[PDB]
Amino acid sequence: PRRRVAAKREVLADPKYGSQILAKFMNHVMESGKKAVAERIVYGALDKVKERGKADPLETFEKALDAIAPLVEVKSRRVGGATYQVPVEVRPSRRNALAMRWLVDFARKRGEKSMALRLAGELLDAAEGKGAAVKKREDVHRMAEANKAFSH
Amino acid sequence: PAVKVKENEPFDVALRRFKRSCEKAGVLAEVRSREFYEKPTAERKRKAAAAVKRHAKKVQRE
Amino acid sequence: KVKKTVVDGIAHIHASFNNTIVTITDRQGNALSWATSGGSGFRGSRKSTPFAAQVAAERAGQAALEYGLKNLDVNVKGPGPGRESAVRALNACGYKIASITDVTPIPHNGCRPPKKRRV
RNA sequence: GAGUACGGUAGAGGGUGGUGGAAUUUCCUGUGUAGCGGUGAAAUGCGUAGAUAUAGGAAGGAACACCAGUGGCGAAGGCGACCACCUGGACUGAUACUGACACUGAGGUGCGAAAGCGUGGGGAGCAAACAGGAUUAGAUACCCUGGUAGUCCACGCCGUAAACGAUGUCGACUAGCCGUUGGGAUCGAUCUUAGUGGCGCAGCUAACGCGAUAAGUCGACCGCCUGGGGAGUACGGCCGCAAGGUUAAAACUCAAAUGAAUUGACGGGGGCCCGCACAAGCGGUGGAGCAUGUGGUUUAAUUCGAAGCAACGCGAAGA
Numbered sequence: 120p121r122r123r124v125a126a127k128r129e130v131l132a133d134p135k136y137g138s139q140i141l142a143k144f145m146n147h148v149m150e151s152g153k154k155a156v157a158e159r160i161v162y163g164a165l166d167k168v169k170e171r172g173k174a175d176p177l178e179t180f181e182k183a184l185d186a187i188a189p190l191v192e193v194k195s196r197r198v199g200g201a202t203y204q205v206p207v208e209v210r211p212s213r214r215n216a217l218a219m220r221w222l223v224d225f226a227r228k229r230g231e232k233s234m235a236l237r238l239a240g241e242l243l244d245a246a247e248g249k250g251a252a253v254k255k256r257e258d259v260h261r262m263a264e265a266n267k268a269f270s271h
Numbered sequence: 272p273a274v275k276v277k278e279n280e281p282f283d284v285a286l287r288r289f290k291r292s293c294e295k296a297g298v299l300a301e302v303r304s305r306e307f308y309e310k311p312t313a314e315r316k317r318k319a320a321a322a323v324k325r326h327a328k329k330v331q332r333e
Numbered sequence: 334k335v336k337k338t339v340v341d342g343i344a345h346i347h348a349s350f351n352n353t354i355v356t357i358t359d360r361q362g363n364a365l366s367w368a369t370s371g372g373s374g375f376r377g378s379r380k381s382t383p384f385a386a387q388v389a390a391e392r393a394g395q396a397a398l399e400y401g402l403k404n405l406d407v408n409v410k411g412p413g414p415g416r417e418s419a420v421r422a423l424n425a426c427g428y429k430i431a432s433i434t435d436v437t438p439i440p441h442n443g444c445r446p447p448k449k450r451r452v
Numbered sequence: 453g454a455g456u457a458c459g460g461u462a463g464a465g466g467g468u469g470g471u472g473g474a475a476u477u478u479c480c481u482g483u484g485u486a487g488c489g490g491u492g493a494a495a496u497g498c499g500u501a502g503a504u505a506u507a508g509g510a511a512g513g514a515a516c517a518c519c520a521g522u523g524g525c526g527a528a529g530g531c532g533a534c535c536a537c538c539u540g541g542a543c544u545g546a547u548a549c550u551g552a553c554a555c556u557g558a559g560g561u562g563c564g565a566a567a568g569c570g571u572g573g574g575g576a577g578c579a580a581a582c583a584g585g586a587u588u589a590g591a592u593a594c595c596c597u598g599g600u601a602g603u604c605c606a607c608g609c610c611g612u613a614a615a616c617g618a619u620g621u622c623g624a625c626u627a628g629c630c631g632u633u634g635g636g637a638u639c640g641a642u643c644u645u646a647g648u649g650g651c652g653c654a655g656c657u658a659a660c661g662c663g664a665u666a667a668g669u670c671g672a673c674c675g676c677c678u679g680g681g682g683a684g685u686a687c688g689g690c691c692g693c694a695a696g697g698u699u700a701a702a703a704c705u706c707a708a709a710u711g712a713a714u715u716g717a718c719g720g721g722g723g724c725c726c727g728c729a730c731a732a733g734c735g736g737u738g739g740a741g742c743a744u745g746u747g748g749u750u751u752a753a754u755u756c757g758a759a760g761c762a763a764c765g766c767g768a769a770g771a
């Protein structure tokens with residue numbers, strides 16, 4: 120807007136795990152106002168992660184998130200005569216939402232049985248970085264690096 | 272124009288001194304003032320405008 | 334398969350608006366290594382940016398490091414951008430900046446410049 | 453009033469020669485190798501027949517950074533490197549001298565930017581014409597790469613410019629304040645001249661504005677105007693080598709053309725500010741079938757109305 124008066128309502132409604140990042144992932148994965156469906160999907164994926172990896176799924180989710188969080192991104196700018204793209208570093212808050220959005224978007228289109236094992240596969244892949252989300256993050260990064268002549 | 276490096280001075284005083292000397296010499300101004308031919312009518316017009324602005328600025332302090 | 338050594342050379346920066354050219358010679362002015370912002374792979378407006386100047390200068394310095402060259406007199410000529418970027422690029426390569434001079438030519442009256450653009 | 457004689461001051465005032473440094477270009481030679489150049493982005497063009505860059509040498513032409521200023525000089529046009537020679541004028545101080553010798557000026561006489569013309573030289577950079585590449589619907593343009601006359605010199609011609617302060621020359625009067633360029637006096641200060649700028653009281657003006665450098669108050673002489681077009685054109689005369697210049701109508705046609713200022717609107721003028729206007733996100737329409745309204749076509753009739761946003765599940769909350 121033009122005022123900068125908009126507030127920031129805080130939502131932290133983790134039922135049993137008591138995690139903040141999990142709550143925002145819930146809000147991201149929720150569709151058409153179906154909270155219960157999101158709860159069941161995310162918890163099934165989490166339980167699959169647990170039954171697969173001996174490590175506790177909390178830290179696996181955290182390290183998958185921290186391996187998909189970008190640092191800089193390319194943004195278009197209207198110079199008045201040319202189509203230019205400038206690299207800008209991410210705001211510390213925005214990278215979490217970017218990672219969540221990328222993860223859910225890439226998980227939505229696997230083609231396997233259900234989003235339980237879809238999100239399970241994505242979390243395992245991004246835990247060390249063999250998922251498509253990490254590849255596209257690296258592609259965005261290499262855009263930003265190849266457009267470093269502007270930088271500023 | 273030219274800069275002296277001495278007493279193992281860090282590579283921060285060197286560039287600052289070089290820039291200060293260059294702007295003292297006004298190399299950039301002179302080279303910018305010659306990229307195109309600038310006809311004597313425009314000469315006199317620009318100088319008259321500079322004179323009127325300079326006198327207005329001088330008066331405006333009182 | 335020809336080899337020769339040299340110490341305490343001079344590096345030239347030619348920084349025009351469109352492009353910047355970096356070259357290295359001895360005190361006798363014999364070319365050893367040169368690099369251009371056009372050759373660094375920019376080919377356009379980017380070629381004018383100071384970052385391209387940094388890349389070209391460091392590339393030429395790293396190419397010329399094969400001859401030793403423990404000392405440099407770097408001299409710059411031209412009003413284009415990247416006038417000082419190439420200096421720091423050369424300092425990154427690991428040379429000793431003995432002196433920095435400008436050799437920008439300034440005619441006293443000279444020939445008349447071209448007609449003014451109407452854009 | 454006007455002028456003469458005598459010391460000084462400043463100045464890109466004019467003319468003829470000579471000499472400097474920076475830079476561009478071209479040629480030769482060494483090192484070196486894959487780009488240079490240019491643009492809004494490109495391409496033409498220049499490059500492995502070795503370019504650009506880089507170092508040294510040579511040739512030639514032209515303009516004279518910094519000083520530089522609301523600065524100076526000149527009748528105007530105009531005049532910036534340095535030195536020598538020839539030469540005009542102006543400011544400045546005292547004394548002496550001539551004793552109205554003054555102002556203006558139809559005709560005439562000269563000087564007169566640039567472009568242009570003639571004869572002969574010279575030719576680096578720039579650059580009409582021209583060639584090629586772009587942009588575009590087209591682009592005989594703006595942009596890019598080249599490029600001839602010309603720009604320079606000598607002699608001759610041409611006589612024009614928004615040749616402008618859009619303000620003829622000469623003389624005398626009329627409150628003040630702040631600068632600045634030359635020169636004087638009196639004790640940094642005060643006064644006084646000749647210029648060059650900024651404000652401002654009266655006064656003037658349609659208004660803008662001018663205001664001791666009048667567009668105020670007055671004198672002397674000269675030039676010019678009489679609605680807009682046709683037209684500064686035609687014919688005649690006089691000049692010019694030519695280009696053309698100068699003097700200068702009429703028929704016909706219209707009821708206006710015009711100056712200054714006021715309010716609004718507008719701008720690919722400027723400055724602030726606001727709105728799901730962008731940006732940051734979510735979800736759709738435009739693709740399918742069906743419902744519904746409209747346009748068109750058909751019909752005997754498809755009953756009238758609504759038509760950019762501000763018509764089209766609208767009058768019609770029931771053919």
Ligand SMILES: [Mg+2]
Binds near residue numbers: 447
């Ligand atoms: Mg150019």
Ligand SMILES: [Mg+2]
């Ligand atoms: Mg060369």
Ligand SMILES: [Mg+2]
């Ligand atoms: Mg040379």
Ligand SMILES: [Mg+2]
């Ligand atoms: Mg004059």
Ligand SMILES: [Mg+2]
């Ligand atoms: Mg001429």
Ligand SMILES: [Mg+2]
Binds near residue numbers: 568
């Ligand atoms: Mg001619």
Ligand SMILES: [Mg+2]
């Ligand atoms: Mg001639």
Ligand SMILES: [Mg+2]
């Ligand atoms: Mg000739």
Ligand SMILES: [Mg+2]
């Ligand atoms: Mg030429």
Ligand SMILES: [Mg+2]
């Ligand atoms: Mg051209």
Ligand SMILES: [Mg+2]
């Ligand atoms: Mg050319």
Ligand SMILES: [Mg+2]
Binds near residue numbers: 599
């Ligand atoms: Mg040429």
Ligand SMILES: [Mg+2]
């Ligand atoms: Mg001709």
Ligand SMILES: [Mg+2]
Binds near residue numbers: 605
């Ligand atoms: Mg001549």
Ligand SMILES: [Mg+2]
């Ligand atoms: Mg004039």
Ligand SMILES: [Mg+2]
């Ligand atoms: Mg007149």
